[PDB]
Amino acid sequence: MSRLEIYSPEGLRLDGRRWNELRRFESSINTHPHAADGSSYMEQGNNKIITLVKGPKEPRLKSQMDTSKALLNVSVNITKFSKFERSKSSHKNERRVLEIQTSLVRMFEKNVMLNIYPRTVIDIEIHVLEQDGGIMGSLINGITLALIDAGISMFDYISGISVGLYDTTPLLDTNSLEENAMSTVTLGVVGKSEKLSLLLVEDKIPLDRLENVLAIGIAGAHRVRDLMDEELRKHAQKRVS
Amino acid sequence: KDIEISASESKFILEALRQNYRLDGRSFDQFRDVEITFGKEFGDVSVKMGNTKVHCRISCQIAQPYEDRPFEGLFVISTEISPMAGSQFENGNITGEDEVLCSRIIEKSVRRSGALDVEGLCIVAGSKCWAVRADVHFLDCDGGFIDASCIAVMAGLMHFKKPDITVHGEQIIVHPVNEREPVPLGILHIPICVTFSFFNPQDTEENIKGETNSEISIIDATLKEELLRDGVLTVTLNKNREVVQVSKAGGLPMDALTLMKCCHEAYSIIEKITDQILQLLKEDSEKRNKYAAMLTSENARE
Amino acid sequence: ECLPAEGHDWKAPTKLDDPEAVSKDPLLTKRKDLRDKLICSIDPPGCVDINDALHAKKLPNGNWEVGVHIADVTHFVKPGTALDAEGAARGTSVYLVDKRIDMLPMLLGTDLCSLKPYVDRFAFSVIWELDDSANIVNVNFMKSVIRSREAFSYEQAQLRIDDKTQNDELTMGMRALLKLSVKLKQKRLEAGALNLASPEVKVHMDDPNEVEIKKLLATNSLVEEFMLLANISVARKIYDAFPQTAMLRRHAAPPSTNFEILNEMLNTRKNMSISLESSKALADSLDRCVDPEDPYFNTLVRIMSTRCMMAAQYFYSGAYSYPDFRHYGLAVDIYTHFTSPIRRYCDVVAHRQLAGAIGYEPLSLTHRDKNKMDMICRNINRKHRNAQFAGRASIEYYVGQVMRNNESTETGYVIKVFNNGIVVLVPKFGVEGLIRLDNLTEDPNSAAFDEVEYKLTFVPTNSDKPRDVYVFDKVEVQVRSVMDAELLLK
Amino acid sequence: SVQAEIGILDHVDGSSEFVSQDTKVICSVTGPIEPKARQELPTQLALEIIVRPAKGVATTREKVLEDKLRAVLTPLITRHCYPRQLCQITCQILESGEDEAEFSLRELSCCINAAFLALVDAGIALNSMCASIPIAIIKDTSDIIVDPTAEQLKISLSVHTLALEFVNGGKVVKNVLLLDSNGDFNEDQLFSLLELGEQKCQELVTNIRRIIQDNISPRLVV
RNA sequence: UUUAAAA
């Protein structure tokens, strides 16, 4: 937009929220019962992510097959119309995207019980229809809710939260305008614990401030877990009855 | 086409770690001694820490700036691993997860974190700028790939000198290297990478919902310690107490207290490696400028 | 590689007729052995670049043997070498306050070329033969070897001349150089020369300490007159042998436009006028523009009239006629620079041309080309103004550091008035200061500016009586540290 | 005078580093090892030659550099005694020592020597020995000079990279392995440099033999 | 587009 106030002395951010408030969280389960065994339409703020889980099934070729566990594939596709300005580049084979795809596989191959499904492959297909800051964390929450829909055994929830540091004030769930004005940290908390399966810091942060940012980060991630959990309670109860 | 590890060797190294023993004889928090070998031309740096040997080559050229940032210069880097450092690296596989994660970590440490003065690399806004390229050559692999490569690039940029340019309104004349002395690049901070390897003597189940943290963390693992590694962490700090970048994805889910402890342990390491590069660059400058005391023009009076 | 291989161990040959010395320097035979002359040096304290060296010896016919000796820089800086081109682009040494950009490496400007005492040094000597009235009888130029007996400073040479128990041949030679300088200066003032003042002030370090005004001594005019006489004598000689490409310096006459606004301020507020019919009339008029109450006011007119003076210029004789060689400030038909080759590059070219006139070494073709000489003169002229503006800014910076780090009250004179600002010149610090109207009064809306009387009426801060401030007013200024370094008015 | 070190890498069968003037090339040899499907040869040994420049990626300039180096090492190795096997020979040029865009003769001369040295340390069957030198002619005197510097190439009319093969104590020349030339020359100057290049490579293998003996002998029975 | 002198 223009030159906005990031965090006014009145504690209000550019979009109206406060320092410890999250964007609206509206998740959806089983949105593609005809295209994949797992489905999750993640709508965290303006972000709109479609996550599909095709598997566990036989691999298309017997070349790559682990006879003691499963193969976890993640396909993150950022559409050209993800932002306001239509992307001119290719995005698919981008080096920044391959880092995200790999970071997601490592994150879940330790949490997903690949041993229960030997000699199989689990394909995860992601399509980002719109992004607005904190896209990494929303990618996390989408995969979690999409595997559960597919009936894949997991040890716990994996929550994705994004935290920014503006001067001396942490900010939960940073949007695009906030990421372009401060440092950003995306966390990957496991359940109600403090175990971090992901820790990405891509901008300079003072060491004396990182610990407090992590504490407020994992605290908001637990809040993200409950919103996903309450979505599964409502989906399971209305489905049985 | 991959390294075969015997069950006997795998069990021995894990139990040795449970007794505070490493095959090479270091400690759990001892970084390998780093050695910097400067080549002939500027930007030719060879880094040797342990048996891992890496070589970096710095270059630059005139290129068009980005349309969204016309006041900044470009920074290119590509780390293609050849079978020279080991026959397990298939040549031509530029999309390898190790090569991908290495470039993205150094690119965040140098370019995104503001180590290289990109604004000083601007000649004319939105038309002409410097595109500094960092070619990293992996010579001998023994763990600590992104640790040594980050030391090589940072030692290379501080040792490299760009050609001099005089702006006459809209024209740009690149002065030959023999005509004018090249100008060194501007470096704001010195990002130094320190990796952490994690092991669990238990299992995955006792680690997800287990309060008792029995993890074993070692600083700068070797190749054999890396192949038996469970979780991996990479932090990057500078002497200004600032966290340049952090990359931890997968492996053992660790807690916040141990990750904060890794940074404070890594700061004492990067603080010493920083002063070594500043000292070894000072000694290499006096090697080339032996009679530099007589050629000084700006001299004090009385 | 262009420097001598001996480095700091370079020594002048004790025997100029030595067969081994003349094998490395065949031009040594064309060099005089003036090492028997009692030569001394008088330079400011803390000097490193010793360019000049004077001596005096009474001749048996009632005259004096006065001779200045200049550092033979051209024996080391040869044309066409990388050492020459590196000094030609610098033009002159820039003298700041803490640092000092040198035109030549310190091997030459400090040790080998500098006329250091007690050591044999190469020099380009100019020997005269003055009478009791300081009249030149015959002049001779030659490259020689000298050994400086001493190296006094201005404050040290003054004590040795004023002392009466030190009566030796070297001290008595300094006595003659004092009585001959005042006779050379008197005949110049009668010929139309100018005597302008300048706030020459310096500071001390440990880190700015304090601002101290520099004092003049009788020995300052001693060296000054013989440096002028040397430059004049060498000017006529290099022009007599190279009238097409002689390195000279001129000074055009100040137009009536420059002294227009200055005379209007002196006539409408002080009823004084500076004569412009001749250079002598300008000097004689400044001596009468003195205020009875303020003795410094006479020097203030000399400072403000210095800005009205035209800028001197380096040039080659092949671009002008002889009546255009006039130097307005010195009132001499021709002039050049020769007595400072370590500092200015103009003296480097003058030394090469003077050596060719005597027959020491043939002048290089780079100093016989009008095109090459023209481009050299435009560079050493641009490098001359840059050096002066840099020296004034370095003094202004370190003085400005004393303003914020040392709060005090000093007296200053105004030199210009505006509708919303007053410029004040302080003799204690030797720098000008602007006092804006917002930082001078509380209500700037109730002010009036009279352009015919050069006054600005306002209501001072913490005062209900409006004050009328004119030009050339002796006021007391203050300094504050109001920052979120500011001068006010008392 | 050139410098050379053998056995510098720990994860390859054979390593070497050839330094001449300003050009520095590190080579790595690993074999015999299991080849791939498209690489295995039914009767003889397969070669995987890969050279890399100091700056930038491996463009088509280094592709012809691999094909010429391949023709030098292929007849030098007894390939028939390693059936269905592979040997990786990677050459990494640390410093070019010339102009990469205008010249490429000094790097070929150092890659040949560095590869032969690494083939000796790895213990591969070699029928003979090898030596390569760069040769150019200054347009001023029009005479033949070996190992010309970087400034001597820009004034050269034609460049040459002669690779020879020596037997019987590094004296008898069995065959001329490679003689790559580009520029302006005639038949009179061809044998004028070929005769001069044969005696400059003879003292090279004599210098190579001394180097590869000061390092292999201490590792054996000593 | 600040004279002269030693720096």
Swiss-Prot record, chain A:
Keyword list, A-Z: Cytoplasm, Exosome, Nucleus, RNA-binding, rRNA processing
Annotated GO CC locations: cytoplasmic exosome (RNase complex); exosome (RNase complex); nuclear exosome (RNase complex); nucleolus; nucleus
Record carries keyword RNA-binding: yes
GO MF entries: RNA binding
Main location class: cytoplasm
Location within or outside the cell: Cytoplasm; Nucleus, Nucleolus
GO biological process: exonucleolytic trimming to generate mature 3'-end of 5.8S rRNA from tricistronic rRNA transcript (SSU-rRNA, 5.8S rRNA, LSU-rRNA); nuclear mRNA surveillance; nuclear polyadenylation-dependent CUT catabolic process; nuclear-transcribed mRNA catabolic process; nuclear-transcribed mRNA catabolic process, 3'-5' exonucleolytic nonsense-mediated decay; poly(A)-dependent snoRNA 3'-end processing; RNA catabolic process; RNA processing
UniProt keyword annotation of RNA-binding present: yes
InterPro entries: ExoRNase_PH_dom1, ExoRNase_PH_dom2, ExoRNase_PH_dom2_sf, PNPase/RNase_PH_dom_sf, Ribosomal_Su5_D2-typ_SF, RNase_PH
Domain of life from the UniProt record: Eukaryota
Protein family membership: Belongs to the RNase PH family.
Assembly, per entry: Component of the RNA exosome complex. Specifically part of the catalytically inactive RNA exosome core complex (Exo-9) which may associate with the catalytic subunits RRP6 and DIS3 in cytoplasmic- and nuclear-specific RNA exosome complex forms. Exo-9 is formed by a hexameric base ring of RNase PH domain-containing subunits and a cap ring consisting of CSL4, RRP4 and RRP40.
Extra remark beyond the main annotation: Present with 5150 molecules/cell in log phase SD medium.
From Swiss-Prot, chain B:
SUPFAM superfamilies found in the cross-reference section: Ribonuclease PH domain 2-like, Ribosomal protein S5 domain 2-like
Keywords: Cytoplasm, Exosome, Nucleus, RNA-binding, rRNA processing
Family: Belongs to the RNase PH family.
UniProt cross-references to Pfam families, sorted A to Z: RNase_PH, RNase_PH_C
Its biological purpose: Non-catalytic component of the RNA exosome complex which has 3'->5' exoribonuclease activity and participates in a multitude of cellular RNA processing and degradation events. In the nucleus, the RNA exosome complex is involved in proper maturation of stable RNA species such as rRNA, snRNA and snoRNA, in the elimination of RNA processing by-products and non-coding 'pervasive' transcripts, such as antisense RNA species and cryptic unstable transcripts (CUTs), and of mRNAs with processing defects, thereby limiting or excluding their export to the cytoplasm.
Protein name: Exosome complex component RRP45
Additional comment: Present with 4800 molecules/cell in log phase SD medium.
InterPro entries on file: ExoRNase_PH_dom1, ExoRNase_PH_dom2, ExoRNase_PH_dom2_sf, Exosome_comp_Rrp42_subfam, PNPase/RNase_PH_dom_sf, Ribosomal_Su5_D2-typ_SF, Rrp45
Gene Ontology terms for molecular function: mRNA 3'-UTR AU-rich region binding
Cellular localisation: Cytoplasm; Nucleus, Nucleolus
Organism encoding this protein: Saccharomyces cerevisiae (strain ATCC 204508 / S288c) (Baker's yeast)
GO cellular component, one term: nucleolus
Record has Nucleus as a keyword: yes
Superkingdom of source: Eukaryota
Database matches in Gene3D superfamilies: GHMP Kinase, N-terminal domain (3.30.230.70)
Alphabetical list of PANTHER family matching this protein: EXOSOME COMPLEX COMPONENT RRP45, EXOSOME COMPLEX EXONUCLEASE RIBOSOMAL RNA PROCESSING PROTEIN
From Swiss-Prot, chain C:
S1 motif domain mapped to chain residues: 400-490
Alphabetized UniProt keyword annotations: Cytoplasm, Endonuclease, Exonuclease, Exosome, Hydrolase, Mitochondrion, Nuclease, Nucleus, RNA-binding, rRNA processing
Subcellular location: Cytoplasm; Mitochondrion; Nucleus, Nucleolus
Any GO MF annotation of the entry: endonuclease activity
Coiled coil: none
Major location category of this protein: cytoplasm
Residue ranges of every copy of the RNB domain listed in the record: 31-357
GO BP field: exonucleolytic trimming to generate mature 3'-end of 5.8S rRNA from tricistronic rRNA transcript (SSU-rRNA, 5.8S rRNA, LSU-rRNA); mRNA processing; nonfunctional rRNA decay; nuclear mRNA surveillance; nuclear mRNA surveillance of mRNA 3'-end processing; nuclear polyadenylation-dependent CUT catabolic process; nuclear polyadenylation-dependent rRNA catabolic process; regulatory ncRNA 3'-end processing
GO cellular component: cytoplasmic exosome (RNase complex); exosome (RNase complex); mitochondrion; nuclear exosome (RNase complex); nucleolus; nucleus
Family as reported in the entry's similarity comment: Belongs to the RNR ribonuclease family.
Miscellaneous: Present with 606 molecules/cell in log phase SD medium.
The protein's name in its UniProt record: Exosome complex exonuclease DIS3
From Swiss-Prot, chain D:
A cellular component annotation (GO) from this entry: nucleolus
Biological-process GO terms, alphabetical: exonucleolytic trimming to generate mature 3'-end of 5.8S rRNA from tricistronic rRNA transcript (SSU-rRNA, 5.8S rRNA, LSU-rRNA); nuclear mRNA surveillance; nuclear polyadenylation-dependent mRNA catabolic process; nuclear polyadenylation-dependent rRNA catabolic process; poly(A)-dependent snoRNA 3'-end processing; RNA catabolic process; RNA processing; rRNA catabolic process
An annotated Gene Ontology molecular function: RNA binding
Keywords (A to Z) from UniProt: Cytoplasm, Exosome, Nucleus, RNA-binding, rRNA processing
Record field: transmembrane: none
Subcellular location: Cytoplasm; Nucleus, Nucleolus
CDD domains: RNase_PH_RRP46
Biological function: Non-catalytic component of the RNA exosome complex which has 3'->5' exoribonuclease activity and participates in a multitude of cellular RNA processing and degradation events. In the nucleus, the RNA exosome complex is involved in proper maturation of stable RNA species such as rRNA, snRNA and snoRNA, in the elimination of RNA processing by-products and non-coding 'pervasive' transcripts, such as antisense RNA species and cryptic unstable transcripts (CUTs), and of mRNAs with processing defects, thereby limiting or excluding their export to the cytoplasm.
Similarity annotation: Belongs to the RNase PH family.
Misc. comment: Present with 10800 molecules/cell in log phase SD medium.
Protein's name according to its UniProt entry: Exosome complex component RRP46
